[PDB]
Amino acid sequence: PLAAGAVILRRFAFNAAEQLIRDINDVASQSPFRQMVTPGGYTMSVAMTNCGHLGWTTHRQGYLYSPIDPQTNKPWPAMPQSFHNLCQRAATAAGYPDFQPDACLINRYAPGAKLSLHQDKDEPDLRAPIVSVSLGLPAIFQFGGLKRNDPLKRLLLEHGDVVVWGGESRLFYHGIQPLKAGFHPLTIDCRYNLTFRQAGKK
Ligand SMILES: O=C(O)CNC(=O)c1nc(Nc2ccc([N+](=O)O)cc2)ccc1O
Ligand SMILES: [Mn+2]
């Protein structure tokens, strides 16, 4: 496999994409996209929001999941039906039928935006996968291994592609390289990536 434990489902969300994007716009009308500030003081080039009971955010110079959007002081918007259903279909196809995400981080990449190499280790049970849905412009996803200096591999993620990051791949260092500018008929000029997470304690 390209990444042990990962299940790549190319175009899995292609048919759902128009509805997914409508729902991104609805979520963002309530909890707007914002460029968060990292613990080191840098404003991220990616802009994010969340839906579900919990949302991933900066708070007090750390990362955590919160039931309240610090920008609005209101709950994050509820998980849209289209999100819930797509995630469950993908996770079930990939062999995680009990995956029940309570958070969905919505990440908007403008041209030039990137995500530096990192791990997602803020979740309480790292045996639960993360389901990652790409929409719009294509991006190069890089990933290594469990160690920061493991050799990097790269793959293009295109509109509609879903990856279920389970098993070992759940813990790999990964990132997204600077987004090339272009046109997409449904997102116009950007990429969105949805990452579904089980963030609450059992
Ligand atoms: O776009 C894709 O294809 C994949 N997207 C992600 O892997 C993704 N991951 C996030 N995770 C973070 C965890 C820690 C962190 N840090 O410590 O600085 C920065 C980020 C946050 C948003 C994401 O869209
Ligand atoms: Mn990540």
Numbering used by the authors: 14 to 215
What does the paper say about this structure?
The fat mass and obesity associated protein (FTO) is an Fe(II) and 2-oxoglutarate (2OG)-dependent oxygenase that catalyzes the oxidation of N-methyl groups in nucleic acids, and, in particular, of N6-methyladenosine (m6A) in RNA.1−3 FTO is a potential medicinal chemistry target due to its roles in obesity and cancer. Here, we report the use of structural knowledge of how FTO binds 2OG and substrate to design potent and, at least partially selective, FTO inhibitors. Using information from crystal structures of FTO in complex with 2OG and substrate mimics, we designed and synthesized two series of FTO inhibitors, which were characterized by turnover and binding assays, and by X-ray crystallography with FTO and the related bacterial enzyme AlkB. A potent inhibitor employing binding interactions spanning the FTO 2OG and substrate binding sites was identified.
To investigate the generality of the skewed binding mode of 14a as observed with FTO, we solved a crystal structure of a truncated version of the related bacterial NAOX AlkB (AlkBΔN11) in complex with it. By contrast with the crystallographically observed FTO binding mode of 14a, in the AlkB-14a structure, the metal-coordinating atoms of 14a and the metal-ion are co-planar with the pyridinyl ring. Contrary to the binding mode observed with FTO, the p-nitrophenyl group of 14a is directed way from the center of the AlkB active site without significantly displacing key substrate binding side chains. In the case of the structure of the complex of FTOΔ31-14a, a skewed inhibitor binding mode was observed; the skewed binding was less apparent in a structure of the bacterial NAOX AlkBΔN11 in complex with 14a. In contrast, the superimposition of the FTOΔ31-14a and AlkB-14a structures with the PHD2-2 structure reveals that the nitrophenyl group of 14a will likely project into an unoccupied space at the active site entrance of PHD2.
